[PDB]
Each structure stands twice: as structure tokens, then as C-alpha cells.
Design an enzyme around this catalytic site. Sequence first.
Site, PDB file in Angstrom:
ATOM      1  N   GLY A 272      27.534   7.100  20.610  1.00 31.82           N
ATOM      2  CA  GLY A 272      26.184   8.023  20.534  1.00 31.82           C
ATOM      3  C   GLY A 272      25.612   7.521  19.166  1.00 31.82           C
TER       4      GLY A 272
ATOM      5  N   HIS B 210      21.955  -2.403  24.297  1.00 27.86           N
ATOM      6  CA  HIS B 210      22.662  -1.906  25.395  1.00 27.86           C
ATOM      7  C   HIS B 210      22.811  -0.413  25.830  1.00 27.86           C
ATOM      8  CE1 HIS B 210      25.102  -0.008  21.381  1.00 27.86           C
ATOM      9  NE2 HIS B 210      25.061   0.834  22.656  1.00 27.86           N
TER      10      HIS B 210
ATOM     11  N   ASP C 103      21.894  -7.198  20.375  1.00 35.55           N
ATOM     12  CA  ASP C 103      21.766  -5.855  20.469  1.00 35.55           C
ATOM     13  C   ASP C 103      20.753  -5.333  20.460  1.00 35.55           C
ATOM     14  OD1 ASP C 103      22.745  -3.952  22.264  1.00 35.55           O
ATOM     15  OD2 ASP C 103      24.283  -3.792  20.903  1.00 35.55           O
TER      16      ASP C 103
ATOM     17  N   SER D 106      24.876   5.119  18.467  1.00 33.19           N
ATOM     18  CA  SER D 106      24.521   3.683  18.911  1.00 33.19           C
ATOM     19  C   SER D 106      23.114   3.443  18.943  1.00 33.19           C
ATOM     20  CB  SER D 106      24.706   2.896  19.954  1.00 33.19           C
ATOM     21  OG  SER D 106      25.931   1.828  20.007  1.00 33.19           O
TER      22      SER D 106
END
Lengths: 245, 14
Positions: free
Chosen positions: A196, A46, A97, A198
Site C-alpha cells: 500500500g 507496478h 518501476d 508502493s
Amino acid sequence: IIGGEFTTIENQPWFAAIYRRHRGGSVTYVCGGSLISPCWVISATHCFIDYPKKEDYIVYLGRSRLNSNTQGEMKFEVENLILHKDYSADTLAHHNDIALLKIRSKEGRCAQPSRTIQTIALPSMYNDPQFGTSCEITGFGKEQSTDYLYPEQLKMTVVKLISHRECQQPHYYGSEVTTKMLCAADPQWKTDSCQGDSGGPLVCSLQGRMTLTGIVSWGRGCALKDKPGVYTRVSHFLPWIRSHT
Amino acid sequence: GXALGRGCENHRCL
Ligand SMILES: [Cl-]
């Protein structure tokens, strides 16, 4: 990271800081990552799906500060950006993800291990820590909801793994969280990953080996009561990681 | 972009 502690890269030496260069030459922080072998950083799809151009990205290792240099740090370009083909996003939940970045210095070289740069072990098939286990997360993400800038110093915190049973409760996430995901949170809802963070590591001590158990993926708000951080369950993706590296 | 949380980093939302 909401709450938790300021840290330094020697404490988190697999941590990769990923930025994106913009037209005009400005650089912005995108996401975290984890060094799993000298040429490969693992992160979340993502973070790149809307700008899937490998040339845009800069990866640092050995870096403790967001906009200043750290002694021993090493800068890389992305030779190959591999996003998961079945990635998708619902209102909250993100699926498959997971992403891989093959890194290369300008000289064509991969990472060189040092006191501030080290790989993190992948988990073994079907082997995650018991729920209730304490694990750590690291990142340059928001420290509070109201932040419009990221912190200048790297942060970490400790959260507890939550069972799928609990995370699937109606006031948590219901059926939106799947068995390919891991929830983790603070029992008091005072510390959490946030925007941030992630793509960054969720690391658990698994049979005395520090292990990349999860990758920061999604969640409703940050440190919100009954809304855990949700993490890509790395152990489910070992065949995919193996095939693409 | 989107400032709505984890999952929204580096996104295009016109
Ligand atoms: Cl599995």
C-alpha cells in the site's frame, strides 16, 4: 508503514494519494505518489500495470486521511498515465518501476501550492546520499502483516540507506537487487514500508534540499530481518522523466 | 488480487 509515526500532510506536502474507482462506484486505495511539478505526480508502474486505464484513477493532494476529507485537499483526474516501457517483475524484484501521472482538476487545472501542497525536488544526475544516511518514507500502507484494512491516518517513518554491497549479500537479496535500485531499512528491522506504500516517496536531505531519492517499489515481506525495502533509484531515471514530462 | 507485499498492489490474480 510498519512502526514509525502518524503524520499530517503539512509535514509531507508533496504526498499524493492515489485511488481507483470500480464499477458500482466503490473506491479503493492503490498507491502513493509524489508531486514533482504542479501537473505531474511520480509513482511506480507496478501500481497500475494490471489496470492501465487512466480514467479509473483519482489523485488527491493535501490529504491526511484515507477516507475523510482534509481541509485544503484537492482532487484530480489523470490526464496521462505514463508507464515505463521496460517494466517487468520477477519473483521479488521489480524493474524500471516508475510511472508518471499528469494530473488535472475537473476545471482543467494543475496543483496549486499551499501550506499542504508542495512539489518535491528531483535529485541531480549520479548524486545519491552516502549509505547510512537517514531518509523518510510516507504512506497509507499496512501497519502490520495481519492488517486487511489500511490505516485511516497518513504515516511516516525514518529508515537508513543500505549499500548495494550489503543488499546484494546472500541473506539479503543477492543479485536480485540492481544498481538501479536503492535499499533502505531499520537497523533493528522494526519499521519499514509495506503493501500500500508502493509508489510513495523516499525523501533524503541532500545538500540541505529535501530530495526525492527513491520511490517505494518492492521487498520480501515487511520489516523482515535481512530483507530491506527496495526503492527505484530516481537519479537513474532523470532522462526518462525529462523526456516524458 | 495479491496480498503478498510491495509490488502486488492493484494486481489481477485469478
Ligand atoms: Cl546513473
